[PDB]
């Protein structure tokens, strides 16, 4: 039973992403002409209030929420990864979970009570209610359901990262039925990263003619939160030249991917604040607890 740390990844630009929504809520009403939850006759007051550009602007903070094994890289996110072939839910929640029960609530209270827009996959849903994250109806209430590739480019930013302008990129190799489906990328610190970075950039012409991105959003930096003694830091790209990886869905990164978290967490040594010269090892469970106790994310098992 894995426990991985779940970290706030707001949107920047949410009058984007209220587009988005309102995109998918009218392509859902032609394709009917199991996306959203269904209002009842006595309900038009509530989706006046939510669908409504106020709703994702004054009144809901949008988040999605990465899954990391990893917090104390979270200062070096350069991008946030998603898989742009499935389906994401959007749904109401709560700031603090039960770490910090019965949450079985009416739509309208869920509205009254909820201060953020959740976005995570299917999978995620049932394991956020039973730890308090997310209410159930009176059962979650689906705000709407998209596509991940509708995200990607989309400008998103953390209150841990050094930077603030972190897109969203495309990695098809994420797998549904592990945590909420999305992924902070550490380029510097994660072989996998670097190397789905890497084919993004390498392939670039495909990658900006396909989704709605450009060749400018794909040169943010990652600061490397991670020394290696002998090998030094950035060990992301480290690990990704020595094995010579082919692609990020090359077989053998799931190995190199496991190896490099172990020797990380084992000999591995800080260097960024709050945490300069402390050993990983200590710094893993300092770092979610100050992310938890900051607000800034969850504890999440499935």
């Keep these: 039973?894995?426990?991985?740390?779940?970290?706030?990844?707001?949107?920047?630009?949410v009058k984007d992403f209220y587009s988005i929504f309102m995109n998918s809520i009218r392509s859902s009403q032609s394709v009917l002409n199991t996306f959203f939850t269904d209002f009842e006759k006595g309900e038009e007051d509530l989706k006046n209030?939510?669908?409504?550009?106020?709703?994702?602007?004054?009144?809901?903070k949008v988040i999605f929420l990465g899954s990391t094994l990893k917090p104390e890289t979270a200062y070096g996110q350069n991008y946030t990864f998603?898989?742009?072939?499935?389906y994401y839910y959007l749904t109401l929640g709560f700031d603090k979970?039960?770490?910090?029960?019965?949450?079985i609530m009416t739509k309208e209270e869920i509205i009254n009570s909820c201060p953020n827009i959740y976005v995570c996959s299917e999978n995620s849903l049932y394991n956020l209610a039973?730890?308090?994250?997310?209410?159930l109806l009176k059962d979650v209430f689906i705000l709407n359901k998209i596509k991940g590739e509708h995200f990607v480019g989309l400008?998103?930013?953390?209150n841990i990262s050094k930077i603030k302008n972190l897109y969203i990129l495309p990695m098809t190799t994420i797998k549904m039925n592990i945590s909420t489906g999305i992924v902070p990328c550490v380029s510097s610190d994660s072989t996998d990263d670097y190397a789905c970075l890497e084919d993004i950039r390498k392939k670039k012409n495909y990658y900006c003619e396909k989704y709605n991105l450009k060749e400018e959003q794909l040169k943010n930096n990652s600061e490397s939160c991670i020394e290696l003694p002998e090998i030094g830091n950035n060990t992301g790209k480290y690990y990704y030249e020595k094995e010579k990886v082919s692609s990020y869905k090359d077989v053998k990164l799931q190995k190199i991917k496991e190896v490099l978290y172990?020797?990380?967490?084992?000999?591995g040594i800080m260097t960024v604040d709050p945490y300069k010269g402390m050993k990983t090892f200590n710094c893993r469970k300092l770092a979610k607890q100050?992310?938890?106790?900051?607000?800034?994310?969850?504890?999440?098992?499935?």
């Design 49 to 60: 209030k939510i669908w409504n550009e106020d709703f994702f602007v004054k009144d809901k």
């Design 155 to 158: 400008e998103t930013y953390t």
């Design 290 to 302: 100050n992310i938890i106790r900051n607000l800034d994310g969850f504890l999440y098992s499935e």
């Design 262 to 267: 172990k020797k990380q967490y084992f000999e």
């Design 1 to 13: 039973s894995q426990e991985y740390t779940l970290i706030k990844i707001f949107v920047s630009n």
């Design 82 to 86: 998603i898989n742009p072939n499935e």
């Design 130 to 135: 039973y730890q308090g994250i997310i209410p």
């Design 97 to 103: 979970q039960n770490l910090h029960v019965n949450n």
